[PDB]
Design a protein around this nucleic acid. Sequence first.
RNA 1: CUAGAACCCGCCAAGCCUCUCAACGAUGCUCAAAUGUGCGGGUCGUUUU
RNA 2: CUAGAACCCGCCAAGCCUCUCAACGAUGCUCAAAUGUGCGGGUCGUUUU
Lengths: 297, 297
Amino acid sequence: RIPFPKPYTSAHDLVSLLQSRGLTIADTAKTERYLEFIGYYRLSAYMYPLLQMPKEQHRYKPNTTFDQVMMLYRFDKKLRLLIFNEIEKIEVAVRSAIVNIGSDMIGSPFWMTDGSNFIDPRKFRHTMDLIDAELGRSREDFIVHFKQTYSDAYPPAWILAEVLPFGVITNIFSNIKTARIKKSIARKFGLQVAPFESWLTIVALTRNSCCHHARVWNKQNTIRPMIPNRMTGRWIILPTDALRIYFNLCIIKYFLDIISPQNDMKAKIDALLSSYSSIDINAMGFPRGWESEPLWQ
Amino acid sequence: RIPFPKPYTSAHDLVSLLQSRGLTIADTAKTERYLEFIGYYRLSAYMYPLLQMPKEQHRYKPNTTFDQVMMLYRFDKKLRLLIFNEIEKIEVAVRSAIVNIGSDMIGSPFWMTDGSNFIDPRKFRHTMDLIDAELGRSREDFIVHFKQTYSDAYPPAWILAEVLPFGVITNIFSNIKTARIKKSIARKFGLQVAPFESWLTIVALTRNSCCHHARVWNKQNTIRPMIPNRMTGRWIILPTDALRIYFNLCIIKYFLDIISPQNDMKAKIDALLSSYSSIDINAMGFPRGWESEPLWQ
RNA sequence: CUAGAACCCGCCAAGCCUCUCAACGAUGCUCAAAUGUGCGGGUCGUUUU
RNA sequence: CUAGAACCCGCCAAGCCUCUCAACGAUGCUCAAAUGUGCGGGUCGUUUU
C-alpha cells in the first residue's frame, strides 16, 4: 500500500489551490474564516457535487461558487433539525405504549425484570448488563429516593423507561414472548408486527443520523424498509425509491398521524424546500407530484 | 426496606384520580390520549410545580389546569431544540480548530496517532481503544477507500476528526503535552487554558442534556463553571446564579460571538420566552435586566 | 447497527374459517385469529445536483 | 461525566519583567511569557413557578 503524499495545507494556500481548481471565490476573508472554523475536508463532502464528471482530476465544473457549498451545508444542517424535532415525539410514544400495554396485559408493575416473559435469556441477560450499567451510574431525582425507600430490585416500568436509551427499548420490544402483547402494541400504531419492527429500526437509525451531524440529503441508505400488506391508515401510491431520505420522512409521518392527528410536518417540509429552493429534489428521492398522496393531505 | 404498594393504574382511572386531587380537566378524551401516549410518570415531573407546598400529601395547589402541564412540557421541548441548534456550530468549530492548529504547530498530518505528543500514556492507550473501536466498525464513504489505498495505520487528523464523538475530542485536547499548542487553541477562542477546558466540559454536558430529552428549565446543575480572569470579549456584569440554565446559554453565546459575529441567538431566546410568556424567568436563573449586558447586545 | 436488529422467495412443524373455492376443510390464510424467534436459497458496494 | 473530566483557598519545584513596588529582582506574576498534568485543605444533596 502507498505512502500518503499530501502535507498539511494552510487555509491561505487552500484558497489559492481552490482558485486554481476553478472555483469562484468572493469576500475572501470570510472563506478563509470558514476554512479555519468549519474546515476543508468537512466541506469537501459538499464541494463534491460541483466537481466535473471525471472527478478523479479534482477539477470543478465551470461557473461554480463557494456560496453554493455554503448553501448545501446550511440546507443539510436545517434538514437534520427538522427530522429530529419530529423523531422526539415517536421516541416518547413508543416507550409509553410498551410500558402501558405490558402493565395492562401482564398485571404486574415489574414485568420488565423477569426472564420468563422474554424469548431468549441469551439476549435478556445481555440487556440486564445495560440496565445495571445505567442504574450503577444514575443519580437522578427519583432513582435514589426509590432505592432508599423501597425493597424490590428494579423500579417498575414507568420509572425505568425514563432512564433507558431508545436502542435498549426497541431491543426489549423484539424479545417479548407472548405474541398477543406484541400484536396489541403494534395494533395501537396501526400496523402488523414485522413492519412495525422494521420501522422501529429505521426510526432508530434515522435518529442516529441526526444526532451525529452526518450528511443526509443525498446519502444512499442500505437498510431497506419493509412494505406492509395490512394497514390502518393512509399510505403512498406512486412508486418511490426506498433508499433515499424520502421514505424515512414517510415512516415518521405515518407514526405522527396516529400520535398527533392535527400535526403540521408537511408545512415544515414545504417551508424548508421552498426556502432553500436551489436544490434538486430528485437527489432527495421524492418522486414528482408527491403532494397528491393520501398520507400528505 | 418497604415493599412497593402501588399497582398499575389504568389510564381511565388516573383521570378520576387527578380530578380527586383537584386538577381541573377539560376535553377529557385528549387528556386520556396524552396519558396513553406521553404517559403519567413522564408528565409527573411537570405536574410537580403545581402541587401545593406540603407536597407529601400529593394534592394540587388550587385553580390549576392540565393545560399548564402541557404548557411547561412544550416549552421545555422547544428549549432543548433551541440549545442544540447552537451547540452544533461549536461542536464543529472546536474539532476543526484542534486539527488545524495541531497540524500547523507540529508539522505532521498524523500527530493524533503518536503517544510522544501526549502527557499520559495511561489515558492515550485508553483512548486508542475507542479510536480502534470506531475504525473497527466504520464503513463510510472515505474511510474504506483510504485504507484500501494507503499504507499508514490511521488517517490524518482532518479525516479522523469526522468520525470521532465530541467526548473523545475534548478528552484528546486535555492530554496535549506542549502547552504552547494549548495556549494557541485557547487563544483562538479568546480565553486562557483552564476556563476553556471548563467551558468545553460544560458544553459537552449541555449537549448531553439536549440529546436525551431531560428536564432542563428548572433543573439544578451541579458541575459549576469556572470564572475567567483574562478575557478577549464581552461578558456578564450583574451577579448571577451559576447552577441554573442561564450560565450555559452565556457560555454558548461567548463561543458563538467568536465563531459567528453576526449571530442571532438573542433573537431566538427572546422570541422563545415571549411566545411562552406564562413561565417565571427567576426559576430559569436569569437575573432581572439581562438585556443590559455587553454580551447580549 | 444505515452490508443490516436489512429486504425478497420457496420449503417445514401446528392451527383456523377473516378472505377464496365443485370440495367444507384445502384448490385458502400465517401481515385475520393463532403462533415458532424453524430451515435453505438470492440480490443489494454507500453523492447523476 | 450535570457529587464532577466540578468549583474555591493556601503551600512547592522552576522561571520572567506584562503588571506593581524604596528595592531592580521580590514587597510582584503563574489565567503576561514560560510551564508541572505537583501536594494538602474546604464547601456543594440535584423542581420557591
